[PDB]
Amino acid sequence: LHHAVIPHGKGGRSSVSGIVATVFGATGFLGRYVVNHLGRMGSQVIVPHRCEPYDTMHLRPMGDLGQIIFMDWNGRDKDSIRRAVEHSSVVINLVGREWETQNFDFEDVFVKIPQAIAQVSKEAGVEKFIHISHLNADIKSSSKYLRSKAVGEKEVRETFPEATIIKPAEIFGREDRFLNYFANIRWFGGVPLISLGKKTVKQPVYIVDVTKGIINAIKDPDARGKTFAFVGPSRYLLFDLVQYVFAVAHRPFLPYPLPHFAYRWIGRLFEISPFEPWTTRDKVERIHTTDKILPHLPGLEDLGVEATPLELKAIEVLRRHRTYRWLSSEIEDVQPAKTIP
Amino acid sequence: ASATRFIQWLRNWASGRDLQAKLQLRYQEISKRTQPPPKLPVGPSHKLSNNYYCTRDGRREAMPPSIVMSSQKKAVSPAPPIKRWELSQDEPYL
Amino acid sequence: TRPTVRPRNDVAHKQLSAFGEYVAEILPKYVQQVQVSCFNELEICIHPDGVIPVLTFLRDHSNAQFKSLADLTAVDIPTRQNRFEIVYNLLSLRFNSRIRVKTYTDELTPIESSVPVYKAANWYEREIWDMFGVFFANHPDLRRILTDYGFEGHPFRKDFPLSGYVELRYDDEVKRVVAEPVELAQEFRKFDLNSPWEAFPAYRQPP
Amino acid sequence: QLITVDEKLDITTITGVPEEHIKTRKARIFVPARNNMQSGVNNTKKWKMEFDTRERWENPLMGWASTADPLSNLVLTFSTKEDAVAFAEKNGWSYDVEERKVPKPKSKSYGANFSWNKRTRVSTK
Amino acid sequence: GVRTSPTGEKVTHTGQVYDDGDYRKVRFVGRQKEVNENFAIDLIAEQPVSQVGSRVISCDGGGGALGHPRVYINLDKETKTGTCGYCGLQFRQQH
Amino acid sequence: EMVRKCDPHIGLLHRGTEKLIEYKTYLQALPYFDRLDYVSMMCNEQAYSLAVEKLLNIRPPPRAQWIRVLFGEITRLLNHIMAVTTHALDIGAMTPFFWMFEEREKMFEFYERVSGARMHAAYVRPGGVHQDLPLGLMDDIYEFSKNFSLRIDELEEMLTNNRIWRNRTVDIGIVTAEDALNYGFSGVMLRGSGIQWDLRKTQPYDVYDQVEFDVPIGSRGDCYDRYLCRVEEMRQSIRIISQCLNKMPPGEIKVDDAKVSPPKRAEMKTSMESLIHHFKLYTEGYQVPPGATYTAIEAPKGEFGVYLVSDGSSRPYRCKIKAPGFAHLAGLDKMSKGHMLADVVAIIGTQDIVFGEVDR
Amino acid sequence: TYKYVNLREPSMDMKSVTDRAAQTLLWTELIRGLGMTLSYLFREPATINYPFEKGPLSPRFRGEHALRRYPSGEERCIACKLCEAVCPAQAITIEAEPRADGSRRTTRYDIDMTKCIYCGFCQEACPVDAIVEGPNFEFSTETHEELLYNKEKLLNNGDKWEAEIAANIQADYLYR
Amino acid sequence: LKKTTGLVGLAVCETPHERLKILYTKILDVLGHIPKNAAYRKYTEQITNEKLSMVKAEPDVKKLEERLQGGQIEEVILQAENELSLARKMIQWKPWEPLVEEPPASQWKWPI
Amino acid sequence: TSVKPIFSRDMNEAKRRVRELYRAWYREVPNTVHLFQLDISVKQGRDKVREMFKKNAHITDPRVVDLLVIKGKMELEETIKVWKQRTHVMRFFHETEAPRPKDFLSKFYVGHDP
Amino acid sequence: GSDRSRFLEGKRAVEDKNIGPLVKTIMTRCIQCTRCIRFASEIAGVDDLGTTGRGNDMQVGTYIEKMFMSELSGNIIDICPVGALTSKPYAFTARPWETRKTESIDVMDAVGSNIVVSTRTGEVMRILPRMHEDINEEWISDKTR
Ligand SMILES: CCCCCCCCCCCCCCCCCC(=O)OC[C@H](COP(=O)(O)OCCN)OC(=O)CCCCCCCCCCCCCCCCC
Ligand SMILES: NC(=O)C1=CN([C@@H]2O[C@H](COP(=O)(O)OP(=O)(O)OC[C@H]3O[C@@H](n4cnc5c(N)ncnc54)[C@H](OP(=O)(O)O)[C@@H]3O)[C@@H](O)[C@H]2O)C=CC1
Ligand code: SF4
Ligand code: SF4
Ligand code: SF4
């Protein structure tokens, strides 16, 4: 170890963890938790960002002076990528959109960009590489999102064979597009579900569990060249999960079946939005994709993390969706949803 | 200083005062920002003789407190009663 | 006639000495020591049991009339078995004089609240309790006044570290301000300044 | 009226000190040694209490010396060894005490410099 | 003078420069490393030695009370110059 | 909107000033006093300087004492402007604040010209003052003073006889003389109720026994009488300043004793004794003989005192600061009985609170 | 001596009672207060046109710090550490060693400008006028780290501001 | 009769001489229950008699305030009430008794 | 060994005060979870309350017990009157602090602290 | 002493003397106390130091160019009351007030000399003797120092 990266202190804000991490896509939902955890223990974090600097302001309080470094980068320019990684010991890739745009599509963000980061990182001598894939990645999937995840995951593996690839289920948390997505359907009255959501099983995972898994993968030498599946502790039918969301938010729940073709037609309607789409056809498919069971892969327990149950943290996410009448309701008012042994 | 006669009369009348004689903005009546150098005086201890520090050493004349009573006639007060104050001849009543 | 030396006032010294023993004559049950400093301040050292009798006498007696509690505070001297010294600074407008009354206590012994004598003492005693941990009995409302809510310890104790044990920051994961063990990017640099040569022979202590 | 409390004074649960900085610390009770660069002895009069030294590391930004030890600068002065020990007992700290070192009395004789037959005779003044 | 390390980083007048593999140089990427280009060690060495006709000379740095404390320098050795310990000006005895 | 209980929760500006001072030499601790009542900076410095001078048994020279009184009264003007105009501003009269902070702006210029800092001058020190007046400064103070009384009149034309101002202030926050004494009040909080007390008169310091001035006294013990007392005190400060300008004597400005006050720079660079004493004063600092004093002054907000404990070394052992606003705010609940929400706004202003000194 | 601020007995003659009746009903004292704000409307305001115009300062002003040189270009600082000792805020950090020649010079000289109280004790303590507070007060930054000055930044400040600094010391050094 | 005492909350006394005779007399009676040799009894009887002599000798209220040298006559009456309250409390406190306890060896030794 | 008491003459009186304070805290936890809108459950709050009482279970000095009860009551008054904020109430749970090892080997790897 | 000077003349200036790599000599600071001479003779048993000339020009030194390299030579740094004899390795690195003093034991021999380790900001700056009458008195060897 070079002398500047020998750990020192007691793992606090002013300590030296010895980690020099470049986190791509740090300005997102997962990125803010990864940067927070890295900063807590005194890591040097490089945050290359495409967005406008106002949108990185929430990251600045997460590290001691000089520990959070911001760079500009473009996914299509390799000089920008190489400048951001050439001094790092671990590169973390959290890049992704849930929708396509006129400038970037699922192939671009889930294949070309991850491959370029892995390619440039390897040439720069970066030793650790963590890449976030998806539990349901599949070339036979209806959703181009999941098809692109399968291709990119493969690509990263050849380009950077020692990469740790992490495949989470849907991640729930304060800024998620999962529990919040279901709660915001109330603005349309009833909740449409394909086949009433009785033919779908989800295994959502908690954001902090995923973050701790990523942090523990950096330090663990066993995590190199491995693929992990980060899943929550319980499996639910989609109908029960959405019903549970509305029970915690104390909103009237009026589910009704909607066929795939009709509901695929609603997704394209919302895709017209030149801004962030409320929903897309791809999202409709992903929501209704049953979460795979991959026993051969290691999970959170193999990284020393106890998966946090949904029931213990839903109120943390869903309290703000309640009206004034129900804001103060406590965590014990709603019965847990039915699980699947 | 540049106000016209009419405005000077108007604002003088409105305030009831002669404002021009006591203007709140500063002009040429204030000191120059470049001044001749000073030559400051010296204190009384600047002497070449009869100036032994032991004879003008305030700190070394401070003594530990005088013990009046340790737990080892006319009544008195801490000081004489305070003399009563007098009304100002300048302006007793505001 | 000595421009740099502070002049003495032996009249005030004489007057304060006479009053100091006058108080010792009237309150012998409590007064343990009376002294007058070279700059003419009178201190009465009393047994803690006599806080109310002594302060009440100084306030109400016709030759005292110390109607104003200027200041009430504590000093921590760890080398003493009664480490805390409680200091009352009183002012008599009638006689244009000041007097200091001092007592002592430890971490576990309560001192009687002097709010019945001086209503000014209410917040001064909360501050002493807050910063030193001295408990004042029969206080109408004793609680922290200066330290953060839930703060642990008494910072003005000499053995409490300058920077404390905890520091605060905002944590994005829990979306609130959190407290965590203190780490300093630059440790406070302790200086050893005392000269090894004695400065004031008048205060030398026997070997 | 007074009560009998038949216990050794122990105030560790009402001082606010974290658990770690009561039982892992080691206080040293000593009289500081004279700074040998000077002859003055006025800094060898009182007893001191100090705690064990812990890690100091370099701040990555400026290179300053960082610390996570809240007691690094805590030094207490006491009149006697007994006072220091009593303060450490009631606070729960493990301590080591070191006897005061007083210089030995020397036999000095200016005339020894000019001895008729001894080796103390000097060859220069 | 301001050298440049084989990486290209400028070396300061204190001899500081991050070595290869020191992550801390990331702090200068997209920015710059602040280096004063006027090395005092070089500038003082450009002052000519002053010839004086006495064994002892005094230096206050010039400018009276604007200089440094006045010190007296011995010039007895002829194998070297007398240097001011405050400002580094050099003096030599004129035969 | 009737107030039934006022429970002031303070300590939101507690910065452990008194613990920090224990790690500082006596010189190093002086700037902490600028930052207590940060509206009366030099008055805070003077209270500390008097206390240290008393323990040192030294005396500042006459010119320094005169400069201290001069800038003490200038500081009283700075404080009373802030006290009255922010009080008026809280009651809804915003305009006088602007007229008068242009005068306050001119007084920061006097601060900056003697110290180089507009507010935290650190100018008054144990032994005298740091530097002598720059040439031409007393002329400028005189020009400022010659017009200030007119500015006070303009303030009075807006408030004093304004029936709206009187409605908001008359019979609000009445405190009896007996209560004010027992509650630890001082300054205008005593004189508003008729108590005839002013430490500049009864326990004078520096050269206050050489200037003539009148102490304003109220009759009804309410906000309006305390407002009038503060306004009249500004006129008396102008009266004192006029005497300080005419009576300013020549001579040195810090005690000619280089074991307390640092030598002049020219001497430090020439004399071996001066260099040694400069070196030691700016590293170890002067030692103070062991002792304890409670020293107090008539600060603009009332009695400001320090209980300063010395253990013989160059760093104070204990420094308890007596802030007048601490006692006054503790009496806010007493004064607000029977009043409405908007009166508590007036009562807070009449007490003239700055939480730097209250919380330290 | 004391005076009464509010101890008046008002006149009860008919003229005085009617003068107060007119005042109450006709709001005369309220109109008088309007006249005073009207008189300010027609005064020239005190605003200056910042940043084109600047507030007056004096040579003593305590602003941004700088490390100075002798005319030959040698550093004035001799690593005596008096400024570090006196700094009330412990804002100065210094390391030193013999330079490549025999000179006593600093290898580290930092000022944490976010610890500094701009008190000027360091320039008072300095025996060689090496560390000064300059006249610059317009150096606000976008990041905290930009206010942690190392020796290179401070030497640059001295080289940047020496022309003004030397003239300010020239105006004030006879008061010091 | 004065219009005001000038101190807020201190009302003007119609009959100051009569009030002062009653209060000093009450003080003296209360002092008669303190032990004879107690210093509080001796000093307080001494000063109380002195004031009582002035009250009888001088009938003019303005002139009486000049003798008593204790402020307004209403301030003197209040002070006599305070002393009377103190005397009653001193009987129960009994501070003429010997010192309750010596302090520890060097409780009052400064510097340490 | 004769000293001035605070509130309790002996340890049996002191334990009566301790039991009373425990009841007040036990009753309060349901309200505190509601008013402050905490994401912990009432059991968690009551478990934390129990934990804080058991760290002091070894005291044998009634004056020390009297002070802990005194401090515990001020602590409770801050909570009931909502002088505390959510951050102060949650400081008891140390959510953002990582677990420090207690075994020798884990301490050995990280650093030098005993 | 007094707080000021009345000396209105020029000062003496003495030339410096090389006595080896451990002790720096700035002899204009010497106050002619002869502590080094007496230590060199009596404690180290070396008669190399002395005084030359007389009057105001009397100079401490070796007269000839000579090294004072006793195994106890570093102790003349401590006894010298002024900065005339200072430590070359320690030169300019630290000031006294800013050092933290750890009382420790030397391990360069089996004598067990008591020392004070002076540290600053997590760095060892110098070694000083610590008086122990029954071991090293108040000296240490050069290897220890
Ligand atoms: C021949 C037969 C004829 C019969 C008719 C003859 C009658 C003629 C005389 C009648 C009286 C005329 C005036 C009547 C108007 C109301 C007067 C009034 O009520 O003002 C008094 C009011 C009370 O205030 P105060 O003094 O505190 O209390 C009094 C005792 N309680 O105080 C106030 O109201 C003060 C209000 C404060 C707010 C004022 C803010 C604005 C001030 C400037 C306004 C200028 C007026 C401009 C009007 C514009 C016209 C369009
Ligand atoms: N439910 C979930 O959240 C799950 C997430 N994942 C994966 O985890 C990773 C992060 O999830 P999440 O944090 O929710 O993703 P977010 O959409 O929340 O944040 C995406 C990040 O990628 C960056 N980014 C997106 N497109 C581009 C682009 N074209 N060029 C440069 N930067 C870009 C964004 O930066 P900007 O803000 O500048 O656009 C943002 O920082 C993604 O790969 C996602 O697929 C896997 C399984 C489930
Ligand atoms: S101005 Fe004051 S606080 Fe700032 S560096 Fe200088 S001495 Fe320290
Ligand atoms: S700047 Fe001045 S005071 Fe500070 S170390 Fe350098 S020479 Fe000494
Ligand atoms: S010990 Fe130092 S001062 Fe004394 S003679 Fe030797 S060199 Fe000179």
Ligand code: SF4
């Ligand atoms: S520190 Fe001592 S030896 Fe050195 S120059 Fe100053 S007085 Fe002389």
Ligand SMILES: [K+]
């Ligand atoms: K030496």
Ligand SMILES: [Zn+2]
């Ligand atoms: Zn020079």
